[PDB]
Ligand binder design. Structure first.
Ligand SMILES: N#C[C@H](Cc1ccc(O)cc1Cl)c1ccc(O)cc1
Ligand SMILES: N#C[C@H](Cc1ccc(O)cc1Cl)c1ccc(O)cc1
Lengths: 218, 10, 224, 10
């Protein structure tokens, strides 16, 4: 499968825009996260090779990466809308509104800061598609299939950068800058998981089964 | 509650 | 200035070997925790010295310098350990005279899980055949990527990144393989930072259960 | 305090 075929398969695998329809904010986010987690398992299964991995691996990668993969989704939706986090079309928050729940302004600042580095770097849709897949496959018989799956999405990202037709020097520099930003996405998801597990312990977040199972995994 | 394995299998 | 000049500045900046005796007696939760914390606190002194010898670091805001060391210190120690451990499979080379086996992590509840992370990642670096000059670049990058001072840090991080791109080119593999090797090295750093988060959580757990001694710099750094 | 001291005084 060529890099272009793979990237086109990721374009196809893209989940649809999800709408949700003090406490209200946090009820909205957990409801969004739970709806998005359903779309994320369809998306994962349409990654060429993913369903060929052992079920243990499939589960372990989703369990590991789900919050990183939501936040990458959020940052892409938010990229054109500076100062704004486009959780959903009917859920658009700014840093101010984060102030209302303890620990959330910290998380909105990371997401918004990382969002602006991606914006300054002019992240392209086809770049986003590759890195999001890589977040999943790089979390953290079967294990060699995983490595092949991951090299192939990495080859695809190198391809997308090549097609911009910037210098080789600059393709390498771009590649590095995009991969370094991922650790800032993973940090923001580390903080979000900590916050969300804290709200669950105090049972202040609606019981949602797939979100719950996904959180318990941690 | 095993909705992840369930969604992965169908 | 030049990538090669920056690489040779990182080479000169390398810390010296920190020397820690292995306990005379077979390891207990305490003896091993006191060994690993005493080492960490000594390395932290040499880490601050190392960072100030990175060109442009000391031109950052004090608060930016502080924030980088506070944010990255455990990932930097752990990148140090994986490199010292690269030529000795199955072992973890904490110091010249502190060479711990995977199974010797039994002695601290939860540390064995941290050792397997360290050993697995160290194996990924062994199979990529991580070169000395790549390591020097990757370790600075962990510090400077942790995450007018904002403009200078971006610049300083672009310069170390430019240096790693140069080192990989001097390997002479195809441009496509230069991109792939750069990507596989950077994606391995996410595994170092993961190991670092579990170890920070482990250290804060051990401090909470008394086990941890009173350790000026280490304590100041953990409380970050 | 120790970090700032080693950064500026050492
Ligand atoms: N910042 C955020 C939330 C995750 C989250 C974080 C903390 C918390 O206490 C509860 C939640 Cl649900 C999110 C929701 C949908 C996305 O697509 C991306 C992120
Ligand atoms: N595994 C390990 C420790 C970090 C550590 C982790 C957990 C814990 O409870 C206490 C410590 Cl100190 C280390 C020491 C020196 C290095 O150069 C690298 C790592």
């Amino acid at each position: 499968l060529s890099p272009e075929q793979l990237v086109l398969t990721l374009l196809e695998a893209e989940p649809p825009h999800v709408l949700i329809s003090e406490a209200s904010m946090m009820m909205s986010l957990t409801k969004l996260a739970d709806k998005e987690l359903v779309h994320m398992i369809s998306w994962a299964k349409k990654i060429p090779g993913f369903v060929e991995l052992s079920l243990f691996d499939q589960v372990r990668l989703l369990e590991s990466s789900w919050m990183e993969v939501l936040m990458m989704g959020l940052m892409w939706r938010s990229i054109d809308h500076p100062g704004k986090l486009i959780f959903a079309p009917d859920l658009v928050l700014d840093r101010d509104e984060g102030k209302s729940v303890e620990g959330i302004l910290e998380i909105f600042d990371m997401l918004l800061a990382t969002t602006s580095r991606f914006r300054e770097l002019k992240l392209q849709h086809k770049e986003y598609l590759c890195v999001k897949a890589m977040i999943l496959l790089n979390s953290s018989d079967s294990s060699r299939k995983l490595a092949h799956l991951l090299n192939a999405v990495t080859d695809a990202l190198v391809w997308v950068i090549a097609k911009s037709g910037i210098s080789s020097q600059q393709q390498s520099m771009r590649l590095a800058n995009l991969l370094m930003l991922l650790s800032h996405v993973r940090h923001a998801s580390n903080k979000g998981m900590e916050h969300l597990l804290n709200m669950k312990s105090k049972n202040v977040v609606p019981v949602y089964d797939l979100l719950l199972e996904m959180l318990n995994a941690h | 509650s095993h909705k992840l394995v369930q969604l992965l299998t169908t």
